[PDB]
Amino acid sequence: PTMRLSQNVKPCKSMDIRNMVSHFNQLENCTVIEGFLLIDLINDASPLNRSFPKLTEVTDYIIIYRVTGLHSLSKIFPNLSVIRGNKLFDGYALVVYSNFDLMDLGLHKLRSITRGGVRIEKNHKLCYDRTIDWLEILAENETQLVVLTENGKEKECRLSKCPGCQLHNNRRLCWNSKLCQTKCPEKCRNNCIDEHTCCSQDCLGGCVIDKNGNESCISCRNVSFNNICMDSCPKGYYQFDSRCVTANECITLTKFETNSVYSGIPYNGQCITHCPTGYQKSENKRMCEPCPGGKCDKECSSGLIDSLERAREFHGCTIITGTEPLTISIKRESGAHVMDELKYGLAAVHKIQSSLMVHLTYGLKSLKFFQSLTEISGDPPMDADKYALYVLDNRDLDELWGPNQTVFIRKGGVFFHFNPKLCVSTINQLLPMLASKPKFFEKSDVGADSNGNRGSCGTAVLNVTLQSVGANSAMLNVTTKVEIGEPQKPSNATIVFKDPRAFIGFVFYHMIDPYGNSTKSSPCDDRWKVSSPEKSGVMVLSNLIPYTNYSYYVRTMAISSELTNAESDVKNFRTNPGRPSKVTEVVATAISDSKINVTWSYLDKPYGVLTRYFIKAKLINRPTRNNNRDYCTEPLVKAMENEYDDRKVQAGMEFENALQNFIFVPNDDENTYKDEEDLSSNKQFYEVFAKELPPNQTHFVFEKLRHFTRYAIFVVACREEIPSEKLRDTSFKKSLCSDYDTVFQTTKRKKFADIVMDLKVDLEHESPVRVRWTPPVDPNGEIVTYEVAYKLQKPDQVEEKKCIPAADFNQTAGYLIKLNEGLYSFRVRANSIAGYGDFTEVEHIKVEPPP
């Protein structure tokens, strides 16, 4: 709604803080600056004994150029909020330049920049400047004017850490660590007093809740009258930038412009410095009135335009005359408001008596800003009077005139070179506009390869067809038939070549791209791999990695002298699934003597869809008893061990022509498997175990296996199959499962099972005692010897123990042990490949030899 703005303003015209600080005494009591505020050449700003919080708003721009002895801008701009940019200095709105003593900005209350942008240069000691998100503070549409350089960023300015508000957006944003940026929510983009207290659309620059609990604008967005904000001025008042004044007041107002001061003219509800189109200032300069003939003509001597600020001087001029060419030489970085400032400075010109020239511009997108231009008289041309339109070295120029815009050329010749983005076809559109009406431009004036080489504009399209694909190979096919030789019945997919030799062959590119968006090659770019030229039109990509998306594209290669170039779109395709890679990190481990566990991962490419996991476990035979060993004379424990090419073809072609001119004269394995287990005859354990597993799994246990034994582990990952593969591939190709490596198990706690049972003793008659025992159900490792122990049932008697290599005591019904009179007990344990067993329980025998 309509409401009061904060405080009562006392505007004052532009101020020039120059030479010495004493001139600051002209800045007090200035709420807002009706023009620009520039600070230049203060030899020492330290003696500043004051701050000026009243200054809040500035209309045109701020430049701080070569101020010395100032550490921060806060002291002089406590409450500078917004820069309306009603006028721009070279398009920028806030310039802080070449200051040796600026440590920090200090712009705490900076809230909105309406036009142009910001340039910061040659402030070595400045820091924290590279933190702020300039794109959020500027106008949203053209935020590009945020250039900064040489702000001590190298090593010394690392203290820009900010309070890390701290690390928002994963970046710091602060005017020194003492503060942090006052971000606003997207709902009221840069239109807030704090991160959640938004502001109404009527205010600009902020708003403060008043004593009544109601909003109060920092400054009115559209206009202001009697400290109140409204959309437009009341009748009898004229808008002067940010406030409405009477005609009498507007007559007194002034704004400085290019070494000149222009008073304000009250016109059409606005206070104006330059009359609008079709109007001219009155003799008393008090009003504008319609121009005779629809527009008053004005003449300006031609001269170079090395920047937008110079261009502003040509405002309102209809005729540019003089032998000097109108040499545009703008050098921007990024396409800033140049297209609009030049429009303001040259939209009026309708014909040029001299010749135009555009030598060496940057960021100049087009000459479309010559809105009213109709005729380049080119009366005195230049360069020996050769040329009337001279375009050169325009690194970012791409189009000359507005769409279907017609402008005459009365004399001279055009000229064009080195313009990378100027497509040749766009130049030829001038052919029907010259006075001489040339049918075509000679190579002496218009370049051949130097123009538009960077513009994807002159490329005839090829209809590449991807013929067939495979595991590692693919075939390409250029469909577009080529008009080689005679043009007989043209328009048949033309792609013409005047002779068979000029066209050396097609060139195919390819490169791995899961995203399928690789841009065409620019000339050291190595992303694309290339193949040699080919004439038949078919190529076979080879050695591709299976199931990888490959981007590829085709173009014609011809001798440089020829120029019938063509290309194709960047199509992409994927290879076939191929064969899955080996399983990674396979290890076997025990859970019990019969329960076993395996762990694996798949940190390598599967090349396809992993339909299933497959594990097969099979045991291996134990070693038998060996005669090259002795037992119980030595213990056994035995832990388990388990190019251009232009010259060549050119020379060949020429020699062939010369020879023609003279010759003639007038006058272990898994191919297939089924889930299963093999059960021992005794049913005690499973000899082998092969089963499928779901793709979820990465580790699994296999149980009821033989103990004291090694189980070979064989792991697999199997892939999907394409319908065209399964419908025909019965036994050939296949290869649907991965490589593998046997894993053997250091099974812990696979020993000490079933020990020994049924120990009994008997005597033959110093009567020897036969001792018998039964081997375990499953040998505790292949038996190599049996240990037998005995003791006398008397105090302090040691338990003797002896051995037998086993399998030979049975023919005696047991092992014979020499023994004497008394009562004795016996014990037995097994000695095998797995080492000692456990001694079984005792049994007793009494010796009583008769005579």
Binding site: D499, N657, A658, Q660, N661, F662, F664, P666, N667
Partner: peptide, 23 residues
């Protein structure tokens, strides 16, 4: 001149090109 002077530049007709024949 010769063939490459009469044809392949300012192209010629087969009938004229027959001049290089009829031993």
């Amino acid at each position: 001149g010769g063939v490459y002077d009469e044809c392949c530049v300012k192209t010629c007709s087969y009938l004229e090109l027959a001049i290089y024949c009829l031993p």
